[PDB]
Amino acid sequence: SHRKYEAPRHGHLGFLPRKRAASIRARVKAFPKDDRSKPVALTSFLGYKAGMTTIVRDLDRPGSKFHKREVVEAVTVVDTPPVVVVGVVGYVETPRGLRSLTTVWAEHLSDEVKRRFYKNWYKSKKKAFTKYSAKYAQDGAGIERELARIKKYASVVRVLVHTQIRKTPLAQKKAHLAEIQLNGGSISEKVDWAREHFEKTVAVDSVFEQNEMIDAIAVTKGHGFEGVTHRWGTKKLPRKTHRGLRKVACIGAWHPAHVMWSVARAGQRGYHSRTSINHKIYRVGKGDDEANGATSFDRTKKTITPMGGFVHYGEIKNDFIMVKGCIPGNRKRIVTLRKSLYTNTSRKALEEVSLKWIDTASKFGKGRFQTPAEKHAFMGTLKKDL
Amino acid sequence: ARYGATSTNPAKSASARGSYLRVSFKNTRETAQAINGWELTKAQKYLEQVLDHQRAIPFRRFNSSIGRTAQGKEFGVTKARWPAKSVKFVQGLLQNAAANAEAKGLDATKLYVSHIQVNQAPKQRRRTYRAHGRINKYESSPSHIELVVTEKEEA
RNA sequence: AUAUUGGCGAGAGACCGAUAGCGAACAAGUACAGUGAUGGAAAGAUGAAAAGAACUUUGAAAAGAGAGUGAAAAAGUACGUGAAAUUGUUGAAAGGGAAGGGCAUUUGAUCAGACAUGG
RNA sequence: GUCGAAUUUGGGUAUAGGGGCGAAAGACUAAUCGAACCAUCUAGUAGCUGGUUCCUGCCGAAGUUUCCCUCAGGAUAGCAG
RNA sequence: AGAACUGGCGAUGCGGGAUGAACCGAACGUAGAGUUAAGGUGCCGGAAUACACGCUCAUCAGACACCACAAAAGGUGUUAG
RNA sequence: GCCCUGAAAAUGGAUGGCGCUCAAGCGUGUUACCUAUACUCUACCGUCAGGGUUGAUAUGAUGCCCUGACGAGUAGGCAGGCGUGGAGGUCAGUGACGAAGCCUAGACCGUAAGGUCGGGUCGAACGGCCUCUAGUGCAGAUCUUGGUGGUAGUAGCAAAUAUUCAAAUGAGAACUUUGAAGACUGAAGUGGGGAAAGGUUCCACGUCAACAGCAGUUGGACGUGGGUUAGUCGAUCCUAAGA
RNA sequence: GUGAACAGCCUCUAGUUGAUAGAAUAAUGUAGAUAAGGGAAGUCGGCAAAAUAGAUCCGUAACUUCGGGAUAAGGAUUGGC
RNA sequence: AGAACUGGUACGGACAAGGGGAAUCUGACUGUCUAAUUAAAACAUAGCAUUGCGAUGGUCAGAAAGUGAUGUUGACGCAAU
RNA sequence: CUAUCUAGCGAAACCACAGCCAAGGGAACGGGCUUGGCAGAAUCAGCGGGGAAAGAAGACCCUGUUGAGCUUGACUCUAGU
RNA sequence: GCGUUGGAUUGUUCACCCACUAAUAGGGAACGUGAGCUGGGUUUAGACCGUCGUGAGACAGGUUAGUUUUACCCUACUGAU
RNA sequence: UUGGCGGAAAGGCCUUGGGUGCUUGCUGGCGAAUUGCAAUGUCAUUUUGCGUGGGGAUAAAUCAUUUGUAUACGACUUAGA
Secondary structure, three states: OOOOOOOOOOOOHHHOOOOOOOOOOOOOOOOOOOOOOOOOOEOEEEEEEEEEEEEEEEEOOOOOOOEOOEEEEEEEEEEOOOEEEEEEEEEEOOOOOOEEEEEEEOOOOOHHHHHHHOOOHHHOOOOOOHHHHHOOOOOOHHHHHHHHHHHHOOOEEEEEEEEOHHHOOOOOOOOOEEEEEEOOOOHHHHHHHHHHHOOOEEOHHHOOOOOOEEEEEEEOOOOOEEOHHHHHOOOOOOOOOOOOOOOOOOOOOOOOOOOOOOOOOOEEOOOOEEEEEEEEEEEEEOOOOOOOOOOOOOOOOOOOOOOOOEOOOEOOOOOEEEEEOOOOOOOOOEEEEEEOOOOOOOOOOOOOOOOOEEOOOOOOOOOOOOOHHHHHHHHOOOOOOO | OOOOOOOOOHHHEEEEEEEEEOOOHHHHHHHHHHHOOOEHHHHHHHHHHHHOOOOOEEOOOOOOOOOOOHHHHHHOOOOEEOOHHHHHHHHHHHHHHHHHHHHOOOOHHHEEEEEEEEEEOOOEEEEEEEOOOEEEEEEEOOEEEEEEEEEOOOO
């Protein structure tokens, strides 16, 4: 009645309500400011988070105790095969908000995506875009018209792309489909680029580059129904308390005579949407490269995949993004990697990294070896073999 | 004789009853309504499946605190269950009726359940013992069930 | 000649009518409670007559459905009438944090008052 | 806590309600104790609390005076029928 | 908290004061037509966004008895003396 | 004078609200307009008052008729009435060809208490009028007795380590019986007997409506029977506190 | 059998396997455990927990009613063959 | 009781099983009580002291009695604090 | 092990009528009234803000020409002596 | 807008010291917050003391021991169909 | 029917070319009553079920089963010709 001692409230009221996300694919809610002066290009990319490993590198940061010295950092690797372009959607400005006027799709869609439109594929007749396809029959018009409508009206333009989830260890056959804003220049140029890419493929190395700071958008890992203590970091009550002690003791004063939206309560924890910013690209992997995991210092032939394989994920056989630190969501989960809404100049953000070594030991226990070759060298001959 | 309100041709109809039956009034109400106006064999088939836990009985009135099932979806509902003892007694009555119909030579294939009504038998009273030397009632809520099958009229 | 809430035998009532009248209209000072002294209920009514449902059919059975008895089963040893609370089913209607009420009229339903003049 | 004695305990026996019994707490005396249980006196008394059952028509108050072990009550006068 | 005279409330609805025992108006059989009271007439809401002369601009204007408060003291704001 | 400073409190919020700035604000003036159960005029109900009229002449003289005024009400007083059990009198009252009772967003009378009728259900008695009489009218009393709801198919049915496979039987088997397995009580026993106490719970056959807070074919349950054998084990005799 | 033992733990004889059941494994509980570094800073208060513990051999203060204090305290040891 | 040998230095391996020390208040101790909120520093106690009484008596019981407790007693006793 | 979900089984408390707020006034802290905010079926697990929630006609206080337990050179007596 | 602390003594609020710190502001929400806890203090019944009283008892004096009940309903709030 | 234009919710606008009805620009030939002196006297647009003839098109979702990126139950996310 004036709280005896003062403390900060538990938890952030800007991340309410703490409910399950609508979709498991978190929504890109903002794309970068468009600079229509530069080449048409994608502003985000879709991938699957595969696991984390460890890096070594010299730091470059004059004035730091750790300048010109080796530091060792957690990284996370996200499996990033090429994305296929299959549509363009045009948006108009209105006094009520951005609104979509049409979507024009590609003549041919793969099963991977088509499957996204069904709940019972095994037994459907797979009629998905079968009448739409015929719009291509006519030398162009129906399609060519709608393209023209987007050129004429339309204020922002997004492509529709999907993951090639089959190029990935996942059991799931259904691919993930998303709109991604086209930021390169000019509405007309945008739709042509889009037209030209229909059914074609786009790789990450045409979106993102080493040292870039990028944002990650993903639904957070679920945890089911949580109590107040772990959900909000409320303080345990004393051992002595009757009727349990993972609670908050006082849910409210007498007036307002209503439990209030700001007190902590049990309920869902996890499976929330997070846009996490400022994650520096430390590697852009090529899938064709059998030295993915190597360095100009660690010259050995090895791929990024850990001995044993990424736990609970499998192998990395495609292009990949390696990002410093960590990212929301869990292994297997779809992630959108978005580019920065701003021009960071951090010095931390401008630093150019070069890896020196990338861990590759088994993450399935205290792994002591990077490559099968190294293991055999150390152990010598066993009772299997030879 | 003397059932509730019926508006059915008694000549095209057959009927069955059971009285002072020891099943739950509330549960069996819920399941009688589940097959009301149903074609007899659909009814027959469905009740057999509710025993198998493949469909369920929607709980619509006597239902607060009852769990939720995916199986209520069919009937636009969230809260359904699988009242075995009820299903079982209603089956007996359906079976009887069906027998009575054959005896009247009604067409088994035209038969639908045109009337089905559970109401409440007199209670059966037992005792529960409670803390601090008290006694409380531990009772049964038995059911009277009546139903009627009728031939659907043609075009 | 007087007394008489006891006992025996009788005639009565502007008395009560089964929550009334004695506690008890009944296998009632019973059943039941309490170590004990004591405390002490509930509970009447199928029909003139059991004619209390032969027989057939479904069911493990209880029973149901037919049939049959009966003036009646809208009397079935749950029994005369069978209210209310409360309930099932059917039919009609209304319902953005109660419902119900008042004056008024729309709309729907329902019910009337007429009554007689030459053919 | 105590655990070979002021020990624990069966049955028998004795003490009965202004009485008993108490290594004493107003404890214990059949879920009862600063006076047990049962029945009767007893429909105990209550200036106090609660309730007090049909309709309409007419008239229509007082909370003030005096006296009272009077001050949550009466009597007295007034107002009212 | 306690007296004086009267009028009220209590025992009493009705119209106004948003609301409200006690203020304002006005007291009451069942109704029709007219007219008013106190109070109102931008819209909520029945009734002139009527007429007339001024005054007022508030980076905290002001807006109606009972009544839901404001003072000393100051202003080269603007008005009239 | 208006305006400005002086002018600080706790959920978000109040000239009643919207909103209004030559006002929809402040002072003043002038008209029109809205509206109470009040005022004016009229109908009708009642109350009170005054007046006329059975003089011979059908049906109410506590009546009929004329006229004026008036109507708020707690506690409370009086009046006129409504309704119930029973009683005297009377309608030579209604009734098994249907009394009483009950049900009925059917009808009619009355300001009202109430009365009356139709339809349905029912089955043996009942009512009007003049009187007489009271154990005579309910919403309440933490009223009495009974009956019933919402609560709710909810709280619950979590102590005592633990069960499993098969066959048999049966309408039916998680729960019965038999077999096998896995375990427990661990002789300070979940073993074998007794004392108080119970009183047939013992045993057999049959057997599930109720009871065993799931079940039941099982039982300390239900029905029908069977069963307790003494000179030597007790009582019986003795004496104890005491009676 | 272990062992000081009628302890605890496991067994034989005998007796049980009876105390609704199925599927999950959220919060919060009830009961049972563990925690890096710090070590009572928690709290009215070390409440609750934790730490000690059998035996053999060594060793053992003040004080004292000369009986005690005292398992004071403090140490080493402990299997199998 | 001793010695050698042996092991991831473990060995009362489960079970079983005292934490210790320095003080102040307080009651000597063991014992007792508020069955169901108080186990204590309260009651008891041994020890100490006081009081009454030689039986025709002290203390206590009963309505009364040819009545009763102490008393199967006698001051190293009974009774009362 | 619960809670949870299922089959079987199945209570109780409490209940004027009910259940969204802000302000106002008001028996001086409204779910209802007045003015505004608003306002969309049917629901599940949790929760402890509010229902001035619920459990015994208030334990404290006062009043009553209401008691009882207890004390005493209060009043009035009495077994005994 | 945003913070406003860690301790010693005390049941304390308060008070007072130590100490850190950007700073260690002051207040409200039924003197917020007990079906949220705790139960140290107050304030039942045990008990010791001092003062008071012939006494029973008393003390706004000290001291010790003293049972903290219910959500499954509505609403609100968290989450979920 | 020829061109065009309109995306803020364009869903409408302008245009070219003939055809067809009407034309109150003007001049003729007929008709109307008795629906009785007002009262019921012009038909609007929404849905929705059916009826005919033409053009057209020829799926899924749910339960159950399954994954564990999810989960108290529902719900979520996967997989299955």
